[PDB]
Design a protein around this nucleic acid. Sequence first.
RNA 1: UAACUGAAGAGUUUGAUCAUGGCUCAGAUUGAACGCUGGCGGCAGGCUUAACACAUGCAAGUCGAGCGGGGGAAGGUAGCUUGCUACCGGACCUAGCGGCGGACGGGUGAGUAAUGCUUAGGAAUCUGCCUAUUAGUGGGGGACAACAUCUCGAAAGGGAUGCUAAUACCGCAUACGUCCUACGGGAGAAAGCAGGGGAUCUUCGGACCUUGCGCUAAUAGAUGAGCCUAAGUCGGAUUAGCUAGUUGGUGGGGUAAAGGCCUACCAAGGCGACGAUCUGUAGCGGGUCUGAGAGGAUGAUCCGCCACACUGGGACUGAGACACGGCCCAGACUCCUACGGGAGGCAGCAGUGGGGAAUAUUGGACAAUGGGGGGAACCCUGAUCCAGCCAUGCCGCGUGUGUGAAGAAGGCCUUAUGGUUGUAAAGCACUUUAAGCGAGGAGGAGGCUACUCUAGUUAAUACCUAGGGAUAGUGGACGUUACUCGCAGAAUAAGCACCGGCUAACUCUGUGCCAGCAGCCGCGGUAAUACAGAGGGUGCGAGCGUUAAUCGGAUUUACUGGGCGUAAAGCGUGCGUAGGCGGCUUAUUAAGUCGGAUGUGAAAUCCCCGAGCUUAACUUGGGAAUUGCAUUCGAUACUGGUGAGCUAG
Lengths: 86, 207, 79, 82
Amino acid sequence: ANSAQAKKRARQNVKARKHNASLRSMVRTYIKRTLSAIAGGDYAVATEAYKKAVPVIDRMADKGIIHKNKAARHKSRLNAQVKALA
Amino acid sequence: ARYIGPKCKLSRREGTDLQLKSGVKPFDVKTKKANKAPGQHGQARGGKQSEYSLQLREKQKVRRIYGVLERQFSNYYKEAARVKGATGENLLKLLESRLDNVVYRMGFGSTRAEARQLVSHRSITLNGRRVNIASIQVKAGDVIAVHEGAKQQLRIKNAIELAAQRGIPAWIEVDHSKLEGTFKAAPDRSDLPAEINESLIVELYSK
Amino acid sequence: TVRTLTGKVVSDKMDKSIVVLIERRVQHPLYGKSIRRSTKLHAHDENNVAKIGDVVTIKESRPISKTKAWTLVEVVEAA
Amino acid sequence: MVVIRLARGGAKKRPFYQIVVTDSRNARDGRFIERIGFFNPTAQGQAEKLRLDADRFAHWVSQGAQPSERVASLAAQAKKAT
RNA sequence: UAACUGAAGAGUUUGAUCAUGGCUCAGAUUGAACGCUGGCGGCAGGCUUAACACAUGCAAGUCGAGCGGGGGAAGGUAGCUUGCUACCGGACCUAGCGGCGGACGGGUGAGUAAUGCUUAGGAAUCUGCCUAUUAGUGGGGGACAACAUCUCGAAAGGGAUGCUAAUACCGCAUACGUCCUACGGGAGAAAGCAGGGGAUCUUCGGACCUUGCGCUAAUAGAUGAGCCUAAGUCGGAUUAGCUAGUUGGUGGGGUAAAGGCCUACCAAGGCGACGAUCUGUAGCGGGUCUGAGAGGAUGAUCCGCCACACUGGGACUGAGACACGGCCCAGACUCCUACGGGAGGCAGCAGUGGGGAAUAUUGGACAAUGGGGGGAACCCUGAUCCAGCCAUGCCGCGUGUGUGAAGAAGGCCUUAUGGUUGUAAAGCACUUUAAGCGAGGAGGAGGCUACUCUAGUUAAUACCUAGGGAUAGUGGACGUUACUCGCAGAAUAAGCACCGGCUAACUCUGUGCCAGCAGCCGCGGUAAUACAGAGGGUGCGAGCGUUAAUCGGAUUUACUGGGCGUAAAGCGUGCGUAGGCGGCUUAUUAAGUCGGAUGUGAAAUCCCCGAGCUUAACUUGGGAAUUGCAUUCGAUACUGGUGAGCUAG
């Protein structure tokens, strides 16, 4: 970078990248836990995992880490897959 | 540019008086070489000429009368061809509408060259402004006058005296006491002299 | 208020899809003689109603696959 | 945002402005949405000095366009004249 | 009213001739270059070649009214070596955190024959700042730069420990809208700052009221962008077969969003002589040049779209980038080094080297129009507006005007004394354009500040917002502006090509197939109108010629608009595939064909009528035009489709 503001932008970019990566990985982990419960197949366990996962997805979507359309897609598809377990 | 040089040899080559001199003395007595070309190989007017030669020699005569060079003359022809009506009539009206020609036909200039000199030196006002362009087109109803500083000039009195001898034109209404005239309308082809065959210039440029 | 086309089915092998051949008659831009031009369109047939040789009507729709953006409306004439 | 501003035309030292509605990110003399009048600061004789279409001006202002300071002054002048 | 109206030929094959057929010439045009010459102004244009390599300066910042620190100037009080010292309250500045901007504006055409462009439509999307409307802005917590200490390095810059503020970050609470839903329910936000003030309290310094700028959730609008479809968009067959995520389907993934976009299975599909695949070339359009038109050539300057940023591969942040002056990786190259370690990308503006036949200043100002930040004051802006250079082009002007013959001199020619130069010159009399000197002087500046009043919102006369009035200040790079008025003096200002025919303009000397000229036919071998000089003339004129290039003439690829017995040209002859075309009558259809209506066909450009430039170039108002495309409604003679019938093929 040639200018001071460009250097500052690069520094802020690095810091925001680390923070966003943390939150995104949290979302992925919760979705993966829900998927693991679904694969296990117990209805109550899958329901508990889904109920745990939904608030995290919603909070990160509100913060802007993911899009709210993405959050809605995840909620709908995971709810359908849980309901399939009867 | 502008042609500067001998005037009478141009008339001799063209074969007709071109009004380049004021007119105190007749052209024949002035030149004594009329009826002959200006070259050492010059002949009489009876020599054979091609159609290209006739067309060229016709346009050169008009150009030498009006003091207009080739590029401006071509622009005049293009404007005349664009404007509806007889092309030769439009071209002649365009030539006569020039400010320097109008001053000469008013009589403040004994020659078109003198009128052009006056216009350039800002001795003439159009409407109420001191213009200095000889090629300004004069429109119907325009008023031409002499500037006060230029008034009381022996050349102007001589020019108006000579204009008194010359035929006063119909389309221009001029009072000599205060030295001011009005352009009423564009002259007609019938009003203009009939020795000019503008059709030759038309066929020259139409090729 | 939808764009429709009428043509002849030239293929029905794939699942839920037909190949319709459209024909148009146009003037040659320079020589002025009317000539024949043909275009091949992939359509969607949910129940595989159409067959080879039928005359069908198709209408423009949102994309359904890589090459399909038209859907069958009705079978005007059956082979 | 959408703005109403002057686009410079004419010749050297004799500017002639078109009043245009455009996205503010476009070039001054480039892409525009709608032309709604003109301004000629050095008009004389029979030349019209200012012309503004008040109906379209009000329509775009209600839609959310932001006039520049000069265009706002010209609109005030046109309203006073009419 | 008007928006166009438009078409020329010539030379050259032969002892003549007619035809055929090439070659050449007369025109228009240019981002031109070169040769000779060169006064001024206005308006434009200015690396077409090396997307070659780049020294140096500038081209992106702004906000203290988001935040904590840290600075250095003026004041005041107290002491006194007496004009010096110690502290204290205000006014300024900014390295750091944070917000917005940096995705615009600017450059270039390398790549790209279709993921691009043009025209016409469409559904499955997101969209900061702007406009309207609705519901809100409650209460806590843990950190990290700055700072302090240590340490490496000449530095530039690095590394390590201990603190701290916020509109930085994360929980909890609440939810008109919003998301999911199995229709039972479940889930998710935010931040403060500033101006003013009556009364009250002030746990002691603010609370409280009010008004702005903000922040959160959402729905519309506007703007911008993403996606899809149809038709059109340069050659090559001495490139004929191409394709296995390939074509389609299902489950799942993924995206803002449809979709083989991805993945696992199932099927064997998909494209191609209406040119697939491969290969050469190329940014596309509005437009520009030429042409009677149809066509042909072209894509500088202006506008729209696309693509690229030393060469390749990626992602981050963000509303928006896979980002010219941001990051990571790889490659080549270049630079500093104290050998420890570092730095870079002009196809931004100016400029340098090189290349080339050839293309300019390392300039001024943010005054105007715009763009970024800010509440404002104001700051930034090589965008822009101007200036400098160049006859590169277009338009305009000047280089003087009248008179002046028993026709001066000199030059050239001569049938030898006349002719031509020529009214040309001298002489006489006038003039002051432009350039020079001096004096005045618009407009491009709308506004802003101060003063006054009115009307809104409020508890308010304060603050803020919106208006009106008069006065005074303040604001121009260009710039000594345009323009106007005076001064002296013809005084400062003319060249270039050609004269055998095509093609306007002719002789004399010099030379003798030499020297030389030449677009074509052709000139020169002792009287050369064709070579060189001179005299004279012709054409243009601050220009004149040459070279290069496009269209034309060329009916010389012939659609408009040509030919094939002998001039070039009928396959050696049949059969036959695709294709092209096809007898008569009738009913029907409305694809071709024709007509109407509606939408669209950006602006600029061309054309017409006006307007302003002293005129013109040029600028500009309004029209006309954009011959096209799409939708829809009609007609049924002809062609096509379908049904029936017939016999001359």
